[PDB]
Design a protein around this ligand. Structure first.
Ligand SMILES: CC(C)=CCN1Cc2c(Cl)ccc3[nH]c(=S)n(c23)C[C@@H]1C
Lengths: 427, 558
């Protein structure tokens, strides 16, 4: 009601106009879920109906959060975000806590609700304009505007920075070790606590939060046994580039030696030091693929030799904070998926494989979709920024089902490839 | 009258200013009509002459046309239109007939000169100033500004769409089951009310608008039952396009062809079968639209063919949210596919067709999928649902396609069904080197400048071979070298190439390309028992490379 806050004056980065991203047609199911959600928002004054004097837009999708509960709207604030928040990060720039990744566990609390209090500058409300679609363009679309701090916008947590701190002060002083990072509206909180301790320390923070500001979190784990998630209780004390083993073929075969020589050849791009010359020799005949040729004493020396140069990594570790990180996925098998995060090719800051073998949920789109997110958290936790994705899926196909299996608050940037993977193997 | 509607605030572009576009002193003659038309217009309350404190000015134009018995005014605020803001994009999307539902009765009501009955923001009025002067020498510069929405300014339609939308609100609040769409300056009201019982409401509506000054000139809702909108032709229970004629004659020019293809596509929405391959392929040249496009027999063959279908009229039914949408697809021929979405047993709702223009050489299964998609998308956009598919391909063929793809896909519920062209993997390579079969070290290259090449090879049994080649680049010879190894091979064969390309293509498990070499490479594989292509980086110094490479010195050396 009637008693509010002051307005931190936001403004679009000079030489930029407001966004006009077009609204992705949505299934009816979601259209309805959106008119519901949206209307209470009109009734609680959070968002207000608008006229044609305003021509902007920034997409919305409905999504069902926390293991299939009821719908939550999501505004794809990427473009706007980009436009205002980029230069706004130079100002109200929140900082990134290195130590974080080092903490045994990082749990994640959605502090989204909060932002729904500080009001928004009358003039900036102009851009928060989202348009909810009507099947088959039968209706003109229920156009809204935003009065409070929209959730997706990145200007919002910078604004709600002030309030959010003090809410935490007394907690931080009693819990100094507990590191608390804030990204978009998500509370990444980590410790080196024995799991149970960390569990508690968190809900302690859950409760505290509620006292101090009716800032409400989700009751992730009650006394009941459930097959539901174990909480995003991350553990960045487990991460590495261990599985890229050159085959251990005792029965080396002409084929083999080729395959091996092959692997070592592009590999030589991420490890300019290795040499396969000495191996391309034991293969110089024009024999049947299936025949053994391990001989060259001088060679068993190079197999072994290069074999371990893998473990011991390269210079590719210059986290340039100016260049933006690129995430990249490769479909690998019946559950295997892999990524690589890098700024300049072969100068990959980190890489990893995702695993969840098609069983009780075989949708590739799903497995991919998930991974894109499990890929993200990391990047956030570590660099404190979303990597641009290189999705190996059809545009049109993804543009349709990401919004389904999706259970996250932010939306990374992405692009789809249509270029076969030489990079396909076991790694 | 005018409408008592809440005006909508408009403002010129940031850092802009009202136009000063002065005008060319039109003939004293129609200079009179500008007046007599303007006086009444001013007297209707649409204009209010003010010439002092308003330096802005636009050009008045005037003339008569389109079976009329009177003068008409012309004025284009184009400069003003340039200095104005961008409003909401009224309708960045028309509805698709296949999505509407059946109603008992409908009616369209022309919304008079709608734009006038509405009032422009009390301030912008200034920026809509015009000057009508009196004779070649004396004109006190009589100036008038607008009050209602200018006839050809940028805001009008958006504002207007909105205003009316407001005006209809309470009525449709009191009358909820009478569907209304608007749009241009046309109001389409429809429902499930008996003809008379329907004209009942239309009157309640018709006066409601009369309340807000929106004189609807429709007497008893006078409207043609066959509505002519966006090419479609609609009725309360059915819809379809109707004036489509393939002009037959000699002197077939580019434009005529382009036109011809558009024409067909459109028909295709409802007309089950239309092909457009050959005719579509021909226009593949650049803008010489004026010249002649010699349609071969292959094209002429399809034209006259669609001409046959396009001759006998087809009709589509409407959506019934009470029933499951269904989509059945068939590979009509080559890269051309077709599909239909029905609700019940045999009344077509919507028809379409996917075409493999995409990349270059594509698998068919892949193709099915790429089509299952376009369909999926289209449905969302219309019925808000996803149709269950009727797909011509067994479950085991597909289930082995996607599991192998490097890309991801999603298979909505579809049931397999039997019909002609059947979707299945023609050939299929092996997974590890076949023991026994003759490892064949394929190779060859060509000299681009001299365009001469040589494909050839060296099995593992002392067996070599080669062929001189004219007009072939390294990529062609490469596959061609695979071609050889496939002729000279036997049932089970192990090939090995230097090529990344050929390695690629052969692996795409393609078919029916526009590349005979390929078509043939495919054909062998098809006719084969156990292939196993392989890849060793060319020039890497593998003897298998070194050698088949050394054969090349027979062409020249470097
Ligand atoms: C596509 C256009 C102009 C639609 C307007 N339109 C009228 C119409 C017609 Cl013409 C045929 C079947 C119809 N089914 C539905 S719903 N409508 C309908 C209502 C809307 C109001």
């Amino acid at each position: 009601p009637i008693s509010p806050i002051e307005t931190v004056p936001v403004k679009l980065k000079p030489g930029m106009d407001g966004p006009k991203v077009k609204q992705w047609p949505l299934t009816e199911e979601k259209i309805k879920a959106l008119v519901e959600i949206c209307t209470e928002m009109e009734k609680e004054g959070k968002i207000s109906k608008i006229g044609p004097e305003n021509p902007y837009n920034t997409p919305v999708f409905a999504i069902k959060k926390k293991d299939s509960t009821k719908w939550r709207k999501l505004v794809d604030f990427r473009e706007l975000n980009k436009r205002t928040q980029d230069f706004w990060e130079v100002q109200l720039g929140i900082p990134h806590p290195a130590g974080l990744k080092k903490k045994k566990s990082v749990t994640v609390l959605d502090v989204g609700d909060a932002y729904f209090s500080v009001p928004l500058d009358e003039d900036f409300r102009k851009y928060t304009a989202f348009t909810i679609p009507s099947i088959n363009n039968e209706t003109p679309g229920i156009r809204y505007q935003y009065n409070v701090l929209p959730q997706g916008w990145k200007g919002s947590p910078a604004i709600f920075q002030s309030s959010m701190t003090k809410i935490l002060e007394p907690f931080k002083k009693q819990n100094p070790d507990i590191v608390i990072y804030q990204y978009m509206d998500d509370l990444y909180v980590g410790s080196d606590l024995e799991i149970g301790q960390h569990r508690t320390k968190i809900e302690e923070l859950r409760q505290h939060l509620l006292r101090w500001g009716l800032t409400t979190p989700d009751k992730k784990h009650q006394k009941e046994p459930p097959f539901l998630w174990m909480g995003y209780e991350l553990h960045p004390d487990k991460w590495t580039v261990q599985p890229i083993v050159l085959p251990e073929k005792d029965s080396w075969t002409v084929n083999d030696i080729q395959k091996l020589v092959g692997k070592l050849n592009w590999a030589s791009q991420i490890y300019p030091g290795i040499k396969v010359r000495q191996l391309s020799k034991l293969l110089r005949g024009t024999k049947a693929l299936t025949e053994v040729i391990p001989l060259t004493e001088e060679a068993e020396l190079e197999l072994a030799e290069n074999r371990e140069i893998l473990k011991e990594p390269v210079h590719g570790v210059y986290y340039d904070p100016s260049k933006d990180l690129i995430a990249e996925i490769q479909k690998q098998g019946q559950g295997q998926w892999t990524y690589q995060i890098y700024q300049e090719p072969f100068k990959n800051l980190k890489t990893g494989k995702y695993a969840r073998m098609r069983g009780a949920h075989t949708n590739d789109v799903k497995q991919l979709t998930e991974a894109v997110q499990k890929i993200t958290t990391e990047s956030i936790v570590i660099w404190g920024k979303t990597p641009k994705f290189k999705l190996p899926i059809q545009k049109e196909t993804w543009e349709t089902w990401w919004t389904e299996y999706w259970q996250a608050t932010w939306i990374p940037e992405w692009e789809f490839v249509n270029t076969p993977p030489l990079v396909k193997l076991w790694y | 009258p005018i409408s008592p509607i809440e005006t909508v605030p408009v403002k010129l572009k940031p850092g802009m200013d009202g136009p000063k576009v002065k005008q060319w002193p039109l003939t004293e003659e129609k200079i009179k009509a500008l007046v007599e038309i303007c006086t009444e217009m001013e007297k209707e309350g649409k204009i209010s002459k003010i010439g002092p404190e308003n330096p802005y000015n636009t050009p008045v134009f005037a003339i008569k046309k389109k079976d009329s018995t009177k003068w008409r005014k012309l004025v284009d605020f184009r400069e003003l239109n340039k200095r104005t803001q961008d409003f909401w994009e009224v309708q960045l999307g028309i509805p698709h007939p296949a999505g509407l539902k059946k109603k008992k009765s409908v009616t369209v009501l022309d919304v008079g000169d709608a734009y006038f009955s509405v009032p422009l923001d009390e301030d912008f009025r200034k920026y809509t100033a015009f000057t009508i002067p009196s004779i070649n020498n004396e004109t006190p510069g009589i100036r008038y500004q607008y009050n209602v929405l200018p006839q050809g300014w940028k805001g009008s339609p958006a504002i207007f769409q909105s205003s009316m939308t407001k005006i209809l609100e309470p009525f449709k609040k009191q009358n909820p089951d009478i569907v209304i769409y608007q749009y241009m300056d046309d109001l389409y009201v429809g429902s499930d009310l008996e003809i008379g019982q329907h004209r009942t409401k239309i009157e309640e509506l018709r006066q409601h608008l009369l309340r807000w000054g929106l004189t609807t000139p429709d007497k008893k809702h006078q409207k043609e039952p066959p509505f002519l909108w966006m090419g479609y032709e609609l009725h309360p229970d059915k819809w379809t396009v109707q004036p489509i004629v393939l002009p037959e004659k000699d002197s077939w020019t580019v434009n005529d062809i382009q036109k011809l293809v558009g024409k067909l596509n459109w028909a295709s929405q409802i007309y089950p079968g239309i092909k457009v391959r050959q005719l579509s392929k021909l226009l593949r040249g650049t803008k010489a639209l004026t010249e002649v496009i010699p349609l071969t027999e292959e094209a002429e063959l399809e034209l006259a063919e669609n001409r046959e279908i396009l001759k006998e009229p087809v009709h589509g039914v409407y959506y019934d949210p009470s029933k499951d949408l269904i989509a059945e697809i068939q590979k009509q021929g080559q890269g051309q596919w077709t599909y239909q979405i029905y609700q019940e047993p045999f009344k077509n709702l919507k028809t379409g067709k996917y075409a493999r223009m995409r990349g270059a050489h594509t698998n068919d299964v892949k193709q099915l999928t790429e089509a299952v998609q376009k369909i999926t998308t289209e449905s969302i956009v219309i019925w808000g649902k996803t149709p269950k598919f009727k797909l011509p391909i067994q479950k085991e063929t597909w289930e082995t396609w996607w599991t192998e793809y490097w890309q991801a896909t999603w298979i909505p519920e579809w049931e397999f069904v039997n019909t002609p062209p059947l979707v299945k993997l023609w050939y299929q390579l092996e997974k590890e080197p076949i023991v026994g079969a003759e490892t064949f070290y394929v190779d060859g290259a060509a000299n681009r400048e001299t365009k001469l090449g040589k494909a050839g090879y060296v099995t593992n049994k002392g067996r070599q071979k080669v062929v001189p080649l004219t007009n072939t680049t390294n990529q062609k010879t490469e596959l061609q070298a695979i071609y050889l190894a496939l002729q000279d091979s036997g049932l089970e064969v192990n090939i090995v190439t230097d090529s990344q390309y050929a390695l690629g293509i052969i692996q795409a498990q393609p078919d029916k390309s526009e590349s005979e070499l390929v078509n043939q490479i495919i054909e062998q594989l098809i006719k084969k028992e156990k292939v196993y292509l392989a890849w060793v980086p060319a020039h890497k110094g593998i003897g298998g490379n070194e050698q088949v490479d050394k054969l090349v010195s027979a062409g020249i050396r470097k």
